[PDB]
Amino acid sequence: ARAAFLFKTVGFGGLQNVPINDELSSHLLRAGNSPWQLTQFLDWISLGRGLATSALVPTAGSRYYQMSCLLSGTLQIPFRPNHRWGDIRFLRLVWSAPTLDGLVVAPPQVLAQPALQAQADRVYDCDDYPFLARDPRFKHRVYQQLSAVTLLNLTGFGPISYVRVDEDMWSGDVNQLLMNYFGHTFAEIAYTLCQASANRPWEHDGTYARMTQIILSLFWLSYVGVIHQQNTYRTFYFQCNRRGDAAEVWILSCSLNHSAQIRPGNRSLFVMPTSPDWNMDVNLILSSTLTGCLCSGSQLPLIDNNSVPAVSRNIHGWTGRAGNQLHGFQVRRMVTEFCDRLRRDGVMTQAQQNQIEALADQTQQFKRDKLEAWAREDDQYNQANPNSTMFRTKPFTNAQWGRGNTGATSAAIAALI
Amino acid sequence: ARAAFLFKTVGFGGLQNVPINDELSSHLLRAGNSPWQLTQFLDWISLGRGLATSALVPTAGSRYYQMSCLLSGTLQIPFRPNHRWGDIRFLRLVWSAPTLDGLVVAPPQVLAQPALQAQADRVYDCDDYPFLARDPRFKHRVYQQLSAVTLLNLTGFGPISYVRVDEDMWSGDVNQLLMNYFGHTFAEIAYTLCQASANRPWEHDGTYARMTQIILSLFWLSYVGVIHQQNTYRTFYFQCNRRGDAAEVWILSCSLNHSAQIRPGNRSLFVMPTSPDWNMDVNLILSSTLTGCLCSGSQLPLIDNNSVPAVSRNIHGWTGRAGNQLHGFQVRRMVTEFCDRLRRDGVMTQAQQNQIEALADQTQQFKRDKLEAWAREDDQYNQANPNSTMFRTKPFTNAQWGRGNTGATSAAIAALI
Amino acid sequence: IPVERYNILTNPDAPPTQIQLPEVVDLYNVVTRYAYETPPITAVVMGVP
Numbered sequence: 003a004r005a006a007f008l009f010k011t012v013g014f015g016g017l018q019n020v021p022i023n024d025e026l027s028s029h030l031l032r033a034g035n036s037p038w039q040l041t042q043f044l045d046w047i048s049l050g051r052g053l054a055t056s057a058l059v060p061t062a063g064s065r066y067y068q069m070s071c072l073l074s075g076t077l078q079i080p081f082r083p084n085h086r087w088g089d090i091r092f093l094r095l096v097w098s099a100p101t102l103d104g105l106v107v108a109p110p111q112v113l114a115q116p117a118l119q120a121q122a123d124r125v126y127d128c129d130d131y132p133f134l135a136r137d138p139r140f141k142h143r144v145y146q147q148l149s150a151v152t153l154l155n156l157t158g159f160g161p162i163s164y165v166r167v168d169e170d171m172w173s174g175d176v177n178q179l180l181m182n183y184f185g186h187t188f189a190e191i192a193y194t195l196c197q198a199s200a201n202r203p204w205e206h207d208g209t210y211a212r213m214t215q216i217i218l219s220l221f222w223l224s225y226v227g228v229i230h231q232q233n234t235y236r237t238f239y240f241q242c243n244r245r246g247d248a249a250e251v252w253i254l255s256c257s258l259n260h261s262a263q264i265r266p267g268n269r270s271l272f273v274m275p276t277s278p279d280w281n282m283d284v285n286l287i288l289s290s291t292l293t294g295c296l297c298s299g300s301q302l303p304l305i306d307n308n309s310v311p312a313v314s315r316n317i318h319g320w321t322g323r324a325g326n327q328l329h330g331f332q333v334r335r336m337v338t339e340f341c342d343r344l345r346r347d348g349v350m351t352q353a354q355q356n357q358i359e360a361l362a363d364q365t366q367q368f369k370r371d372k373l374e375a376w377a378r379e380d381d382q383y384n385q386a387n388p389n390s391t392m393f394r395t396k397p398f399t400n401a402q403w404g405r406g407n408t409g410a411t412s413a414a415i416a417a418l419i
Numbered sequence: 420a421r422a423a424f425l426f427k428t429v430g431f432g433g434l435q436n437v438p439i440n441d442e443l444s445s446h447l448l449r450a451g452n453s454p455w456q457l458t459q460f461l462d463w464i465s466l467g468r469g470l471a472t473s474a475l476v477p478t479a480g481s482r483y484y485q486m487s488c489l490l491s492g493t494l495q496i497p498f499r500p501n502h503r504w505g506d507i508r509f510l511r512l513v514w515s516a517p518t519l520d521g522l523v524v525a526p527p528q529v530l531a532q533p534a535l536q537a538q539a540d541r542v543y544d545c546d547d548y549p550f551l552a553r554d555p556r557f558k559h560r561v562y563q564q565l566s567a568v569t570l571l572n573l574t575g576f577g578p579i580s581y582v583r584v585d586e587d588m589w590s591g592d593v594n595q596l597l598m599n600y601f602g603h604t605f606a607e608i609a610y611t612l613c614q615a616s617a618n619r620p621w622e623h624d625g626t627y628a629r630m631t632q633i634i635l636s637l638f639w640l641s642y643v644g645v646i647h648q649q650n651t652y653r654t655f656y657f658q659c660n661r662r663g664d665a666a667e668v669w670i671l672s673c674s675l676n677h678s679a680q681i682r683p684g685n686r687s688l689f690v691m692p693t694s695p696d697w698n699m700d701v702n703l704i705l706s707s708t709l710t711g712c713l714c715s716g717s718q719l720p721l722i723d724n725n726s727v728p729a730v731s732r733n734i735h736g737w738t739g740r741a742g743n744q745l746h747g748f749q750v751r752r753m754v755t756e757f758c759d760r761l762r763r764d765g766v767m768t769q770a771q772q773n774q775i776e777a778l779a780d781q782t783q784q785f786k787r788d789k790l791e792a793w794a795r796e797d798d799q800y801n802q803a804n805p806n807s808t809m810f811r812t813k814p815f816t817n818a819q820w821g822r823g824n825t826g827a828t829s830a831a832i833a834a835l836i
Numbered sequence: 837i838p839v840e841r842y843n844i845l846t847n848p849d850a851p852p853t854q855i856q857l858p859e860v861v862d863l864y865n866v867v868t869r870y871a872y873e874t875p876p877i878t879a880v881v882m883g884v885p
Contacts, residue, residue, distance in 0.1 A: 136846065
């Protein structure tokens with residue numbers, strides 16, 4: 003039952019200002035002036051042919067990161083001690099009104115004076131800005147994004163997701179209600195749930211909070227290979243079209259007479275892709291968004307300080323002293339872990355595995371060449387115009403392309419049953 | 420926020436029974452049988468030609484005193500320990516009903532038996548008589564008078580008034596509301612406020628309680644000369660027609676751009692005329708009445724025991740151990756104090772002052788000759804008929820015609836700003 | 837809905853008589869309503885001996 007609302011803005015990638023300029027920020031306001039609407043963070047494609055590119059927004063992760071920046075700067079305006087919302091500008095941007103309804107061009111009087119020297123890795127507590135503190139509805143409406151962002155800002159890697167398993171959640175007709183989700187794709191199930199979170203505040207142990215947790219659970223357990231067509235969780239299991247492909251498509255399917263034995267108790271952990279290729283994996287990135295919403299209303303276990311960079315330690319609602327640790331993983335590698343299990347349980351033939359792996363390899367290469375090249379395009383620009391430096395995608399290091407701890411977390415997840 | 424309701428009956432002027440008889444008491448019931456109606460204590464003249472005389476009621480103070488007596492006797496009937504209201508009589512008077520609705524002639528059965536030997540300087544606590552204790556409305560309706568009386572019975576002098584100054588009272592639209600009083604005479608403003616107090620009980624810090632206090636404040640500050648046409652209190656100042664005249668007429672006037680500097684804080688004191696000529700100064704005597712109403716709902720600071728005669732010390736709601744002291748003053752003398760200030764501040768010419776003083780002298784003499792003569796008329800009667808002795812006006816001593824402490828309190832009031 | 841416009845309703849810590857002029861026009865406040873008497877000028881003229 004969450005009570006502390008704080009978020010962490012993004013840090014500079016070695017730049018001397020938030021990694022975003024005018025050209026970029028302006029182009030982000032897709033669905034309107036509100037930086038809080040969903041379609042500002044995720045696009046909606048009828049999937050399966052995926053991978054959306056843009057001149058300014060190369061990948062889906064590119065957008066997700068960019069929004070994180072836009073909010074990181076702008077938000078520092080009303081969060082100052084004087085809590086003024088439109089007296090100073092940030093890159094020629096200014097808030098529309100107290101309730102932070104929308105963003106717009108700074109008034110001449112404002113453009114006349116210097117901009118706000120926004121800093122990096124800041125941690126703020128909503129309850130400090132009056133207007134947010136007085137209206138729980140408003141606060142809730144916004145936090146959805148704020149948390150979703152900090153879940154991408156705690157570490158220099160990808161978007162953190164939350165995996166939990168507890169038979170006690172299935173209490174009530176919760177079971178019935180899920181079956182209505184059979185047949186839908188993960189993407190669909192997530193997008194809708196995320197969109198509908200801001201409608202109104204909900205209870206931390208309500209049919210919503212629970213289902214969203216169960217879905218996440220189901221997805222991941224399947225993604226890794228623990229659950230499958232012949233080892234279902236109460237007959238539920240996400241089936242992937244063709245694992246490894248450029249754009250994966252998972253569908254919540256049903257399978258009878260192969261229910262697995264789940265151990266009584268409550269278990270949970272945090273996961274996060276570490277390989278740059280997450281910027282091009284819509285599901286992984288949605289899964290986090292969803293997790294974000296979960297946080298907007300429920301207080302999850304703290305993330306162990308030792309798993310995150312200095313700057314983001316001891317953040318009241320998120321990172322704490324001794325808590326659960328983060329589990330990273332390379333996308334490619336996990337693919338095999340996935341296969342191995344399926345094959346071993348007799349659902350996949352050795353031959354099939356070989357095909358999938360071969361594809362997964364082909365994909366990784368493709369996705370990398372791109373990311374790596376766009377990266378240069380950026381450095382090339384930054385040198386060209388040092389007064390408006392930026393990043394169209396969260397910075398990544400060659401090291402990030404390794405296996406580092408995949409097997410480890412693979413087992414860890416499997417150990418939730 | 421008043422919680423103790425007690426009053427002090429009047430004392431005998433050296434007589435062996437309350438200073439009132441039948442002839443007198445009967446003639447007082449002017450507006451009806453109720454000794455609680457306002458027009459029983461004050462008459463209403465369109466002012467400026469003032470000084471109302473009567474065969475039995477020489478001055479306005481004469482009436483005020485007489486009522487004090489009437490209530491002092493009658494009230495002792497129901498306030499006995501048996502709390503019976505119509506079994507014994509007081510001078511052939513008896514109460515109409517339990518709720519002390521009105522007074523009437525005692526029934527034959529009652530006239531047959533001896534009257535109540537009423538005593539002097541008694542202090543009673545309303546809450547002792549059941550009917551009053553059970554109905555706050557009723558209690559409040561009556562206390563208006565009861566307090567108004569004790570404010571004339573605590574000392575052998577004139578009617579006590581309460582002067583307070585505190586910028587915190589002006590909080591709210593209180594300011595707006597006052598301006599509606601501009602143009603009216605003090606007499607009018609007071610009469611109405613007094614009349615309207617009994618309508619229903621009010622809160623001790625409500626727009627009423629506050630305004631009535633402010634008016635009193637304004638009046639006195641002007642009466643003494645501290646505030647004036649060129650040294651207003653938030654543009655408010657009472658302007659007297661022609662100070663010194665037989666019957667003064669003050670009007671709440673407005674003056675802009677001459678507002679005085681008021682010191683932050685809460686200050687108060689009690690005043691009271693000591694010169695017999697108050698029995699003929701309608702304002703002074705109204706000001707007390709108003710103060711009375713103030714007491715009916717709010718608990719003012721206690722009056723220091725050392726300022727009042729023995730008999731009236733340690734009276735739970737009024738006099739106490741260490742509190743504020745009483746400030747007396749001669750009417751005539753104050754007139755000069757008034758002038759001096761005005762002249763000094765350059766609002767009055769030396770010439771004008773000389774005229775006013777000369778008048779004030781002429782007035783004092785006139786008013787005295789009368790009071791002093793009616794006094795004899797009384798002693799003359801008392802010797803003639805020792806079985807129905809009385810007093811048409813509160814007894815006074817030659818000493819009472821002195822200056823004694825005028826200058827002192829003059830300064831004291833001025834020291835409230 | 838512009839909460840600013842409804843200050844005395846949406847902000848608990850605000851005194852009933854608070855306005856935000858001239859930067860914001862509140863659309864709900866405390867109004868004082870009166871009822872006066874507007875009589876004609878009356879005059880009773882008397883003569884002098």
